[PDB]
C-alpha cells in the first residue's frame, strides 16, 4: 500500500521550491 522508495525524488522537489520563495521577493527588486 504505497511503499516506493522513489518518493525521495518527489520530496526533494517540494523543498526545492521553498528556497525559491525567499528568492521570489528578490525578483520584484529586479523586475
Cell of 1: 500500500
How distant is the alpha carbon of residue 11 from its chain centre? Answer: 8
In three-state secondary structure terms, 8 is: helix
Rounded Cα distance, 26 and 29, in Å: 5
Residue 6 belongs to domain spanning: 1-31
User: Which residue bears the cell 500500500?
Assistant: 1
Rounded to whole angstroms, how far apart are CA atoms 11 and 18?
11
Residue in this structure with the C-alpha cell 504505497, named with its chain if needed: 2
Report how far residue 29's alpha carbon sits from residue 21's, in angstroms, rounded to the nearest whole number: 14
Grid coordinates given for 30? 529586479
How many structural domains does the chain have? 1
**DSSP one-letter code for 27:** H
- Could you give the residue ranges of the DSSP H alpha helices within 1-31? 7-29
Amino acid at each position: 500500500s504505497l511503499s516506493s522508495s522513489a518518493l525521495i525524488g518527489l520530496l526533494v522537489i517540494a523543498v526545492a521550491i521553498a528556497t525559491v520563495i525567499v528568492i521570489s521577493l528578490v525578483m520584484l527588486r529586479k523586475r
